[PDB]
Amino acid sequence: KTVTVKNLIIGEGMPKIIVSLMGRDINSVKAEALAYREATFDILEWRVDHFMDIASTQSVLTAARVIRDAMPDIPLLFTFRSAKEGGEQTITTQHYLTLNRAAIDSGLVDMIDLELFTGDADVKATVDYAHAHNVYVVMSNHDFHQTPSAEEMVLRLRKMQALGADIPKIAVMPQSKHDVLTLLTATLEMQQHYADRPVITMSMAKEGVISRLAGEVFGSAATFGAVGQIAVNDLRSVLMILHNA
Amino acid sequence: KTVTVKNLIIGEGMPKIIVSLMGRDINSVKAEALAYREATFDILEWRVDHFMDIASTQSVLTAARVIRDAMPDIPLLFTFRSAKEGGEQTITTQHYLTLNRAAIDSGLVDMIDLELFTGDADVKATVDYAHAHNVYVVMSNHDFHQTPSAEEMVLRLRKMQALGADIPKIAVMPQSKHDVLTLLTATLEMQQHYADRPVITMSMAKEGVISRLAGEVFGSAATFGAVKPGQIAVNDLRSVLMILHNA
Ligand SMILES: [Cl-]
Ligand SMILES: [Cl-]
Ligand code: NA
Ligand code: NA
Ligand code: NA
Ligand code: NA
Ligand code: NA
Ligand code: NA
């Protein structure tokens, strides 16, 4: 039930810490990667939707290459978060496909984030393309407005598994403390009944912070930190304390 | 609605850290009291049921006095945990009530722990006596075998409020991770619908540890740490509580 990338075992032990690059251009991305040398985390995510020149596949690959070469030994996750799912800018489905395929077949990334709701033909084709090139798929879904029912969330995570996700991922926005418990309930129901691979879940915002800390208990394999948001050192501290309790 | 004891506001801000002192005899209680001075926590609980001279009221009050003299400014909670609810030794109900009344009227302690199911008439009488002597009551219930339904837990916490508890407290044993969520659910239901005073809740054991850390989110006003299952090192507990508070 694990996914191993560059000696990192996702899906056992303590949840793994993901930090994200958000620079606009090559120099900005270089400066972030340099600053991140002083940090301790497990997975580097490039948030491509924060990059300015996403129109050129060449520009995107050149930046991916800079990042790959800046941190050659870190698991590298390529993520274009669509505006549709809370990201920073819009993209056509075809161009989203082009960028993901190019990242996959370039050898520059270990994992890609693929949004479940992209469309079935495109999701299946891109999953197959990733796997054929030895790239893992974090298949993702986000609701930045509200929290669906536990039943609906569990079905989405199960659907991601059925479609070949290596790591299903869901992130939802609480509108109450109750909604945080609903997210934890859905996570646990995956953990103990349907999951046969690692899953990542989160309740967003201040209210949902506990979901970023309690992954080892309820069944989320990774968590996002910052070099609602939580500093990576504080995150590490809590994860270790929980792991050794 | 809060409870303020020696400038500590229970029911606001970060959950308050309680540590338990457990010396078997007067010399050990003395030594522990002195050693605990350097640990950082909010409330000192004396676990009287671990004391092996409970036969003598004088011995018990002298031990309380030694703790008070070592820590004059700490909120001090006197707790005889009954054998029925998981404590170290069986004593008669009258003996239990006498020890609590003597603690109350001594002026040595700020709070007592009184078990909800001691009996309604005896609980009411003891609550009234505590209040007559400016002592707060942590009214408690335990299930060391299982986690009752969220509705049963809420029922008990509400009964504690009805009986005049200053701080209702429930501690239950998870048999699964699901049971930990049940305890958090009951805690939140109290917070948002029924509580009109601070409430302490916990899921015990290793599986329940997250409940000792997430009190600020779901509405538990205090949590137990260890100076030296589930009670983690007090410094680690404080670190996590601070990180959650400031996130
Ligand atoms: Cl294209
Ligand atoms: Cl995310
Ligand atoms: Na992507
Ligand atoms: Na879009
Ligand atoms: Na190819
Ligand atoms: Na007592
Ligand atoms: Na007893
Ligand atoms: Na009196």
Curated annotation (Swiss-Prot), chain A:
Which InterPro entries does its entry note? 3-dehydroquinate_DH_AS, Aldolase_TIM, DHquinase_I, Type-I_3-dehydroquinase
Q: Does the keyword Secreted apply?
A: no
Would the keyword Metal-binding turn up in this protein's UniProt record?
no
The UniProt entry, under Pfam families, shows: DHquinase_I
Instruction: Report the active site residues.
Output: 142 (proton donor/acceptor), 169 (schiff-base intermediate with substrate)
Q: Which GO terms describe its biological process?
A: 3,4-dihydroxybenzoate biosynthetic process; amino acid biosynthetic process; aromatic amino acid family biosynthetic process; chorismate biosynthetic process
Q: Which domain of life is it from?
A: Bacteria
Write out the entry's keywords from A to Z.
Amino-acid biosynthesis, Aromatic amino acid biosynthesis, Lyase, Schiff base
Enzyme Commission number(s):
4.2.1.10
Q: Enumerate the catalysed reactions.
A: 3-dehydroquinate = 3-dehydroshikimate + H2O
What the record says about activity regulation is: Inhibited by (2R)-2-methyl-3-dehydroquinic acid.
Where do the annotations place 3-dehydroquinate binding? 20, 45-47, 81, 212, 229
Pathway involvement?
Metabolic intermediate biosynthesis; chorismate biosynthesis; chorismate from D-erythrose 4-phosphate and phosphoenolpyruvate: step 3/7
A GO MF annotation of the entry reads:
3-dehydroquinate dehydratase activity
PANTHER family registered for this protein in UniProt: 3-DEHYDROQUINATE DEHYDRATASE
Instruction: List the NCBIfam families.
Output: aroD
Give the quaternary structure. Answer: Dimer of dimers.
Known role: Involved in the third step of the chorismate pathway, which leads to the biosynthesis of aromatic amino acids. Catalyzes the cis-dehydration of 3-dehydroquinate (DHQ) and introduces the first double bond of the aromatic ring to yield 3-dehydroshikimate. The reaction involves the formation of an imine intermediate between the keto group of 3-dehydroquinate and the epsilon-amino group of Lys-169 at the active site.
Record family assignment:
Belongs to the type-I 3-dehydroquinase family.
- Protein's UniProt name: 3-dehydroquinate dehydratase
Q: Which gene encodes it?
A: aroD
